[PDB]
Design a protein around this motif. Structure first.
Motif, PDB file in Angstrom:
ATOM      1  N   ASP B   5       0.819  -1.207   0.000  1.00 16.18           N
ATOM      2  CA  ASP B   5       0.000   0.000   0.000  1.00 16.18           C
ATOM      3  C   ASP B   5       0.856   1.261   0.000  1.00 16.18           C
ATOM      4  O   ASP B   5       0.464   2.274  -0.590  1.00 16.18           O
ATOM      5  CB  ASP B   5      -0.942  -0.004   1.204  1.00 16.18           C
ATOM      6  N   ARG B   8       2.002   1.732  -3.491  1.00 19.21           N
ATOM      7  CA  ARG B   8       0.892   2.200  -4.312  1.00 19.21           C
ATOM      8  C   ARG B   8       0.669   3.705  -4.200  1.00 19.21           C
ATOM      9  O   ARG B   8      -0.081   4.267  -5.009  1.00 19.21           O
ATOM     10  CB  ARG B   8      -0.393   1.458  -3.934  1.00 19.21           C
ATOM     11  N   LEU B   9       1.304   4.367  -3.230  1.00 19.37           N
ATOM     12  CA  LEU B   9       1.185   5.816  -3.122  1.00 19.37           C
ATOM     13  C   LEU B   9       1.808   6.518  -4.321  1.00 19.37           C
ATOM     14  O   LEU B   9       1.367   7.608  -4.697  1.00 19.37           O
ATOM     15  CB  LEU B   9       1.828   6.306  -1.825  1.00 19.37           C
ATOM     16  N   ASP B  11       1.623   5.475  -7.494  1.00 20.45           N
ATOM     17  CA  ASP B  11       0.570   5.493  -8.503  1.00 20.45           C
ATOM     18  C   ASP B  11      -0.569   6.418  -8.091  1.00 20.45           C
ATOM     19  O   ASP B  11      -1.174   7.091  -8.932  1.00 20.45           O
ATOM     20  CB  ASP B  11       0.053   4.074  -8.748  1.00 20.45           C
ATOM     21  N   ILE B  12      -0.873   6.461  -6.791  1.00 15.43           N
ATOM     22  CA  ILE B  12      -1.933   7.342  -6.302  1.00 15.43           C
ATOM     23  C   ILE B  12      -1.594   8.799  -6.599  1.00 15.43           C
ATOM     24  O   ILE B  12      -2.462   9.595  -6.978  1.00 15.43           O
ATOM     25  CB  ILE B  12      -2.171   7.113  -4.800  1.00 15.43           C
ATOM     26  N   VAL B  13      -0.326   9.171  -6.424  1.00 13.48           N
ATOM     27  CA  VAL B  13       0.090  10.550  -6.663  1.00 13.48           C
ATOM     28  C   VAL B  13       0.183  10.832  -8.158  1.00 13.48           C
ATOM     29  O   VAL B  13      -0.216  11.904  -8.628  1.00 13.48           O
ATOM     30  CB  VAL B  13       1.424  10.838  -5.950  1.00 13.48           C
ATOM     31  N   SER B  15      -1.438   9.483 -10.551  1.00 14.12           N
ATOM     32  CA  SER B  15      -2.739   9.371 -11.202  1.00 14.12           C
ATOM     33  C   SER B  15      -3.186  10.687 -11.827  1.00 14.12           C
ATOM     34  O   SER B  15      -3.255  11.716 -11.147  1.00 14.12           O
ATOM     35  CB  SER B  15      -3.790   8.883 -10.202  1.00 14.12           C
ATOM     36  N   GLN B  18      -6.401  12.790 -10.491  1.00 10.51           N
ATOM     37  CA  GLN B  18      -6.241  13.761  -9.418  1.00 10.51           C
ATOM     38  C   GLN B  18      -5.101  14.739  -9.643  1.00 10.51           C
ATOM     39  O   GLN B  18      -5.170  15.866  -9.147  1.00 10.51           O
ATOM     40  CB  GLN B  18      -6.018  13.044  -8.080  1.00 10.51           C
TER      41      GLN B  18
END
Lengths: 308, 44
Positions: B5, B8-9, B11-13, B15, B18
């Motif tokens: 997890d 995965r930050l 990819d979260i950033v 993305s 957003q």
């Protein structure tokens, strides 16, 4: 003789190293079993050809000396990995010294070599793109790298848009399966399994023809005719109360969406629909045994398609 | 101990839905990537 003295006193190790003068195999190995890459860099600075010597020594001792997993590289051992990562462990150098450009290059090479897992290839491409964006490259180099990555992204998007009905029909793993090409994408979009194949699917399977490559060898026109024949096989023209019932609604929508009003855009839209054939399409209709059903409406539509 | 997890930050950033990467500086994003690499070290 070094292994015999490994259990003995180390006060004579320096004496043995100075007796076997110009010691490379002993010096670089004492600097590699410990965390003294500052000592290794001092030896490389105060010597002649020591860089080309240590490079070939690490190449020969690949899996024996120079690895970052044998030394505990999170400490002075990581200060050691800082100098032991030169051109060999650039991946770890990226983590321990912020080598974002080298990280992006290595991730791009890994994604290009990746063929086993499409999900892993996509993850590697994303990581390479993120590293390149977080790197300190100039605007021009960054834009060039972004366009190069966008090319591979557009290539992968074809397989990414695989239909979930065809994937379940073929019983393929969601993420542990290979990738596809434009021809396979068109074939899946026009497959009978796609029960809800609509005008959008037809437009996609007709726009995916510009990425085939070697059009004269891949028979672009055969697929163009097959797609137009499937667009009427899915139409299933019937008759109601002795009168022709137009079921070619999908073909009508495709022909109305092919024209993007290029008359106001300056393209030669007038006479720009010579792609679809008539006699070659009727041959396929006879092969499919739907000619007697669809031939009246084919000409009826081809009249308003030559008047349009 | 959620190393996956934490990784995965990235990819979260990154993305584009957003565009969170546009709100972070160079040095701060580099420190976040270093933290992600430290998490990957424990994952290894």
């Amino acid at each position: 003789l070094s292994p015999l003295l490994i259990l003995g006193q180390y006060a004579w190790a320096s004496n043995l190293a100075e007796k076997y003068c110009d010691f490379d195999i002993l010096v670089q190995i004492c600097e590699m079993t410990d965390n003294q890459s500052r000592l290794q860099r001092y030896m490389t600075l105060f010597a002649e050809q020591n860089f080309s010597d240590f490079l070939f020594r690490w190449y020969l001792e690949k899996g024996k000396r120079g690895k970052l997993l044998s030394q505990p590289a999170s400490q002075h051992g990581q200060l050691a990995a800082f100098l032991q990562a030169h051109d060999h462990l650039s991946w770890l150098h990226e983590l321990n010294s912020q080598e974002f450009e080298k990280a992006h290059r290595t991730l791009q090479t890994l994604a290009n070599m990746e063929t086993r897992y499409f999900c892993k290839k996509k993850t590697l491409l994303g990581l390479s793109k993120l590293a390149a964006l977080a790197s300190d490259f100039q605007e021009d180099v960054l834009q060039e790298k972004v366009e190069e990555i966008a090319e591979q992204e557009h290539f992968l998007l074809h397989q990414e848009t695989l239909p979930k009905k065809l994937l379940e029909e073929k019983q393929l793993d969601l993420n542990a399966m290979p990738v596809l090409a434009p021809f396979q994408l068109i074939q899946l979009y026009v497959c009978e399994e796609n029960k809800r194949a609509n005008e959008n699917d037809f437009m996609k399977a007709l726009d995916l023809l510009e990425y085939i490559g070697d059009d004269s060898e891949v028979d672009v026109e055969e697929l163009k005719l097959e797609i137009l024949c499937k667009a009427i096989k899915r139409d299933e023209w019937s008759a109601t109360d002795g009168k022709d019932d137009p079921i070619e609604a999908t073909k009508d929508s495709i022909f109305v969406k092919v024209l993007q009003n290029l008359l106001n855009k300056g393209i030669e839209l007038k006479g720009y629909l010579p792609k679809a054939e008539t006699l070659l399409q009727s041959e396929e209709l006879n092969s499919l045994k739907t000619n007697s059903y669809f031939e009246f409406s084919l000409k009826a539509n081809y009249e308003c398609y030559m008047k349009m | 101990k959620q190393y996956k997890d934490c990784l995965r930050l990235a990819d979260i950033v990154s993305s584009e839905n957003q565009k969170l990467y546009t709100v972070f500086s160079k040095t701060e994003m580099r420190n976040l990537l270093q933290k992600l690499r430290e998490s990957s070290l424990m994952l290894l």
